[PDB]
């Protein structure tokens, strides 16, 4: 039975960035523990679907421990022990009782706390959820944690030069389709929607990336779903059966069909909304002394005057920081300001890299070029509602251009002339 003044439950992005903030805020040896079911210290999860899969110069632990993903210092296991912050690894909590402030591990150990930070992130929706036949065949893989990534690297090696089917057209789908093609697989991506990345992309943006990918040799099958998987006598996947009637041969299948916030330990004990744990502007739940951050939190997004849940990395880092600031502020008598987040999303495919800021609401225009067979692609999009820019996307931007579009999203400037916005889209951003 161990007690700590502060317990972070989960050892991911938000956990690590919260530890770093606790350090900055003066935490003392013996005050803080992090409990994680993973066997390693907090790391930059984004590396797992990018640099981890590169066929050379790949990312590997301990290189991508937090906080190197945002250009900060690296927090190795030794940083935590030198600060007297205890890492309790390979420990999965299976029961949380918020009244008695007690956590229980699968093996029966118990942990009590005074303040709890719920940083349990998301799990992955699985094809067993859809009732897809044969979905338990071997070499049908999902990607969330570094153990998953290691299985994937192992399959990439064992099936070298084979066929991969990627089930899903979101973030995992785009990144993994690219990764498998770069590792010399024949790759087909399958999804039900009419264009990829429906959670952000417009039809116009999606067409650029889908043409890019098919020019690289990736096949895309839209408007269908998997209905079953053939397997061999060892139970290893051999083929994906589609609802449209097509059967795709496959040595590896990777699935990216959505994440789910891991809130199940807390059902009934805290207020929920939009699938996550409802919080205030300081990441406090409906239970005092219990905070939720990162992917599990539904919080007030001040600039859009709405409750939202964000399932991306920038928010996991900044929410973690805000929570610790609020906790420390409450212990002194000190005021903290309400979280004021600008959504920042990004991804990379092959030699492409885009950034998006703000809100994808209103009607869209493109600017730049747009031609996927251009020497060096560089184009963007503005989302315009009520005469003002609410969202901005840019592929191929310099650091100054990226900062400029972020300033557009943050300040929501009015648009006088649309044709002058489309010719000179970034001149507009730079004048803001
Ligand atoms: C492969 C991959 C690539 C990504 N890349 C990007 C990207 O490029 N850009 C971007 O904006 N976003 C990206 N994301 C999303 C981003 O990483 C998440 O928003 C971020 O990790 C959320 O941080 P978190 O702390 O809330 O959760 P997570 O980092 O998932 O951390 C949750 C932690 O809690 C542990 N946990 C859960 N339940 C328990 C329990 N019961 N007991 C003990 N431990 C538990 C988990 O094992 C894990 O350590 C990506 C996600 C994935 C999966
Ligand atoms: N660059 C990034 O921001 C980035 C990269 C990797 C992962 N992630 C995160 O990791 C989590 C997992 O990503 P994800 O791509 O699984 O989810 P996502 O929410 O980004 O995409 C879900 C996708 O599942 C597909 N889908 C739904 N039903 C399906 C079906 N029946 N059959 C085939 N496809 C179906 C859709 O094409 C949809 O695009 C999310 O939180 C995501 O934000 C983010």
């Amino acid at each position: 039975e161990k007690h700590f003044k502060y317990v972070i439950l989960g050892g991911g992005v938000a956990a690590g960035y919260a530890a770093r903030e606790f350090a900055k805020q003066g935490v003392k040896p013996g005050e803080l523990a992090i409990i994680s079911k993973e066997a390693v210290a907090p790391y930059e999860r984004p590396a797992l679907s990018k640099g981890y899969l590169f066929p050379q110069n790949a990312a590997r632990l301990p290189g991508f421990h937090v906080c190197v993903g945002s250009g900060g210092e690296r927090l190795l296991p030794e940083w935590y022990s030198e600060k007297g912050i205890e890492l309790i690894l390979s420990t999965e909590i299976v029961k949380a009782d918020l009244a008695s402030k007690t956590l229980t591990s699968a093996v029966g150990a118990t942990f009590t706390y005074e303040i709890l930070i719920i940083a349990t992130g998301s799990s992955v929706i699985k094809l067993s959820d859809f009732g897809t036949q044969g979905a338990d065949s071997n070499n049908i893989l999902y990607l969330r944690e570094v153990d998953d990534a290691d299985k994937l690297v192992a399959a990439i090696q064992a099936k070298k030069g084979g066929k991969a089917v990627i089930v899903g057209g979101g973030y995992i789908g785009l990144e993994l389709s690219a990764a498998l093609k770069i590792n010399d697989f024949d790759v087909t991506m399958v999804f039900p929607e009419p264009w990829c990345m429906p959670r952000l992309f417009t039809a116009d943006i999606a067409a650029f990336y889908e043409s890019y990918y098919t020019n690289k040799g990736v096949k895309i099958v839209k408007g269908t779903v998997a209905v079953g998987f053939d397997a061999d006598a060892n139970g290893d996947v051999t083929a994906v059966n589609l609802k449209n009637g097509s059967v795709l041969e496959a040595d590896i299948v990777v699935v990216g069909v959505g994440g789910r916030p891991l809130t199940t330990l807390f059902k009934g004990q805290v207020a929920e909304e939009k699938g996550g744990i409802k919080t205030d502007a300081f990441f406090e739940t409906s239970v005092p002394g219990v905070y939720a951050v990162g992917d599990v939190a539904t919080f007030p997004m001040k600039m859009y005057n709405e409750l939202r849940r964000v399932e991306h990395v920038d928010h996991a880092r900044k929410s973690a920081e805000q929570a610790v600031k609020a906790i420390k502020g409450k212990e002194s008598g000190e005021s903290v300001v309400e979280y004021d987040y600008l959504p920042y999303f990004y991804s990379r495919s092959f030699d492409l890299g885009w950034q998006f800021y703000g809100d994808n609401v209103g009607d869209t225009i493109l600017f730049g070029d747009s031609d996927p067979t251009s020497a060096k692609p560089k184009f963007g999009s503005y989302w315009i509602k009520d005469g003002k820019v609410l969202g901005a996307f840019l592929e191929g931007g310099s650091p100054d251009e990226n900062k400029a579009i972020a300033k557009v999203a943050k300040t929501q400037p009015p648009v006088a002339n649309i044709e002058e916005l489309k010719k000179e889209g970034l001149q507009f951003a730079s004048k803001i």
Side-chain angles (χ1 to χ4, degrees), residues 9-15 35-38 45-46 48-50 91-94 119-122 143-145 172 175 262 265 293-296 311-314 316 344-346:
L9 177 53
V13 175
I35 305 173
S36 190
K37 65 191 183 61
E38 307 195 63
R45 192 155 321 280
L48 300 181
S49 57
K50 298 172 271 307
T91 297
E92 171 171 358
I93 299 303
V94 299
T120 53
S122 303
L143 185 66
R144 184 76 201 174
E145 301 192 334
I172 289 284
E175 295 192 6
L262 277 178
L265 291 172
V293 299
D295 274 5
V296 301
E311 54 193 301
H312 291 283
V313 84
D314 181 70
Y344 161 44
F345 307 136
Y346 67 97

Side-chain angles (χ1 to χ4, degrees), residues 157-302:
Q157 282 155 25
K159 304 300 176 171
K160 172 170 157 68
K163 297 173 178 182
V165 177
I166 300 320
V167 178
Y171 282 99
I172 289 284
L174 262 65
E175 295 192 6
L176 290 192
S177 286
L180 280 291
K181 181 77 213 172
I182 291 164
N183 281 276
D184 198 46
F185 283 72
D186 164 334
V187 180
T188 308
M189 180 168 35
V190 187
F191 54 86
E193 301 86 359
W195 67 83
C196 67
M197 289 282 296
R199 187 150 70 77
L200 191 59
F201 287 5
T202 61
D204 288 293
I205 297 160
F208 175 94
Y209 293 94
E210 289 179 17
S211 291
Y212 204 88
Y213 276 60
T214 51
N215 295 336
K216 293 295 187 168
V218 176
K219 297 162 300 318
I220 301 179
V221 176
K222 313 198 260 182
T224 199
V225 298
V227 301
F229 294 92
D230 293 355
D232 64 19
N234 193 50
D236 304 340
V237 68
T238 57
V240 187
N241 295 319
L242 310 177
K243 201 165 205 184
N244 72 8
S246 298
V247 170
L248 311 167
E249 287 168 17
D251 298 310
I252 305 177
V253 178
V254 188
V255 182
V257 303
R260 60 174 171 96
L262 277 178
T263 60
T264 166
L265 291 172
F266 311 101
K267 306 299 283 195
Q269 319 179 52
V270 295
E272 298 194 332
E273 200 169 329
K274 304 194 183 171
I277 292 170
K278 181 177 197 217
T279 81
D280 69 14
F282 312 97
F283 292 96
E284 206 175 21
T285 64
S286 73
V287 181
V290 174
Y291 291 75
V293 299
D295 274 5
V296 301
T298 291
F299 64 95
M301 209 187 272
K302 190 165 192 284

